[PDB]
């Protein structure tokens with residue numbers, strides 16, 4: 060993954076995201092979020108999801124929290140308190156740690172100001188911690204805004220590399236485009252049933268039909284939105300609906 | 307910008323850039339002390355030289371900060387140790403002279419060898435051999451000759467070297483804003499911060515004898531008991547008005563009186579609690595012993611261990627040529643790595659030592675939440691006292707019966723409990739006069755009250771007067787007795803154990819009082835006592851983040867020194883001593899001497 064001060068942000072659209080694997084996999088050490096109930100991810104449908112993946116230190120996962128102070132939360136990646144999404148943090152010691160001392164992933168430590176919600180700043184400038192300009196030189200009261208991680212093979216929980224990806228579900232004026240599928244049951248015939256064919260609802264009894272839909276229509280009707288023929292969204296066949304008997 | 311923010315930024319940079327370096331140094335030291343190899347030699351060399359070389363610049367930055375206005379008491383607390391001059395204000399000549407003097411003292415102390423006049427081609431060293439032969443001998447002549455040989459082929463040359471070291475270190479203190487080296491040593495038990503919790507540097511000087519004088523009845527009764535045993539022993543050597551000699555102290559210096567157990571047996575027939583044979587009959591492996599100790603620690607309430615300690619560290623029987631020195635230690639490597647170093651064996655002494663080292667581990671993890679600069683206790687007395695609390699708590703018969711070791715039908719009576727109390731006191735309270743007089747001698751020599759000529763005469767005079775140990779043969783000025791010691795020739799503080807005994811007994815009594823236990827304190831078990839564990843957790847977790855007097859506020863409600871727990875523990879023993887030697891009178895005469 061990316062560094063915490065340069066977290067990899069990707070915009071995701073028009074993908075049928077099955078969050079069931081996310082909901083069930085134990086590979087994710089952290090699945091702790093509040094924006095959406097974890098069981099309703101498939102049903103709720105959004106647009107232009109933002110996946111921000113990075114590698115941090117183990118103890119920094121609590122830094123990722125709305126209205127929370129810290130080091131990487133206020134200097135590397137700030138979360139607005141109106142988060143609608145989730146955070147996935149999992150231990151990856153064998154993935155991003157080295158026996159000789161891993162120092163690849165750096166983290167911002169000193170910043171002149173705070174960070175805006177969902178703001179990414181890649182500024183690499185000398186820090187003026189005193190009353191004299193540092194001129195890009197580490198003099199008196201002059202330090203480095205970034206520091207390095209200390210991943211070691213014998214490091215326990217809290218120091219090992221943690222891979223964290225945050226998913227932000229934004230619902231703006233554009234039509235929603237990212238969400239999972241709906242389970243399709245087995246088809247029955249010749250029985251008074253009720254159905255939800257591809258979003259078109261109705262109660263009746265279905266039979267095999269011989270009508271020839273022209274290759275782009277979906278369903279047919281006779282008079283005043285009284286649907287008579289439908290096409291199954293799976294096998295591409297034409298059935299017809301008649302009402303359940305009464306009198 | 308304000309100076310406090312600059313100091314905080316300096317701390318944020320320095321702790322981060324020093325954590326990795328000290329972690330590497332600890333890794334190298336542990337690797338050598340576990341995987342002994344020639345490569346590990348230069349491993350520690352090149353991982354420990356960098357520590358000092360980097361701390362050089364770390365202290366170099368800590369001079370531009372005016373450490374007289376930083377507030378909140380937190381930045382100042384760390385920066386005071388960071389802004390420590392120590393031995394960095396010298397010229398090359400004096401510094402190299404001090405280094406050479408320490409080197410020659412160490413070499414002479416570590417080269418100790420004694421050969422008899424008849425055969426000078428086979429000497430024996432301070433390692434077992436001479437030591438075991440003389441400390442557990444049967445005749446007087448070999449003990450006297452061994453004492454003379456050690457005092458005449460080790461400490462004879464060290465008089466001028468010790469004098470030069472003492473004066474040079476006093477000059478070090480004077481150039482480093484201290485009147486004495488003893489003042490620097492006493493600066494540990496002192497805080498200059500919060501009002502009402504302050505302790506002065508000169509307070510300890512009076513307080514040591516203030517808390518030492520109350521054991522004078524117990525010490526004198528034990529001394530009279532030992533004297534009566536000696537008179538009943540080999541005669542024409544002990545007088546009813548004198549005291550016990552110097553070479554019959556059970557040791558070289560009389561520092562520890564554990565080996566005098568057999569000669570001063572009150573009952574003798576009744577044995578102590580020792581079911582090591584029951585353990586080996588149960589065929590317990592060392593992991594079972596460690597698991598039982600962990601179960602006791604969890605029953606107390608101390609936090610659980612993290613995984614990795616039981617894996618990366620060696621546990622038992624290293625075996626083949628890849629040897630491992632196993633001095634009992636609880637290695638605080640840090641950065642999610644904490645280990646132990648021990649030759650764990652199935653024996654009660656090893657069981658108590660494992661409890662001691664696991665208690666040291668628990669204390670070290672207690673202040674682990676502190677930053678790098680403050681991952682240690684407020685004073686040197688808390689560490690070993692915490693270590694020995696769970697050593698004292700694992701000796702009660704009830705715990706041994708509860709771990710399925712003692713017999714279910716093993717009942718406790720007066721005789722065995724009294725014997726256990728007496729044997730515990732033989733080592734615990736049998737060293738305080740010697741420690742007090744040694745610290746007094748060091749304070750006097752660093753202050754300079756006594757002149758160069760009146761060093762050893764005064765030492766032996768206050769040994770006869772306070773401790774009660776006499777001159778076997780006369781030595782005036784050509785034998786340097788204190789330099790023939792580990793803590794005097796290695797520059798290690800000895801008040802650490804003096805405060806450690808008081809701390810451990812105070813904490814033992816505190817947990818026993820707040821553990822819902824009634825009866826003798828020697829049978830008090832802190833196992834399955836959640837309130838005692840809560841108290842110990844709430845206290846030990848602070849570390850050095852709080853002053854020692856402020857630290858002396860949670861386990862015991864008293865911030866002052868009280869010797870009362872020491873007498874509280876050994877109350878039945880003193881009560882029996884009040885009637886055993888009801889004929890011989892306690893005390894001794896200084897004018898009496900073996901030769902005079």
Ligand SMILES: *[C@@H]1O[C@H](CO)[C@@H](O[C@@H]2O[C@H](CO)[C@@H](O)[C@H](O)[C@H]2NC(C)=O)[C@H](O)[C@H]1NC(C)=O
Nearest residue numbers: 240243244245246257290291292293294295296
């Ligand atoms: C939807 O996926 C199913 C699963 O493969 C497809 O069903 C297969 O279709 C082929 C082609 O007729 C058959 O040979 C297989 O026997 C079918 N497998 C089954 C029913 O398990 C189906 O064709 C796909 N339909 C669409 C529109 O994509």
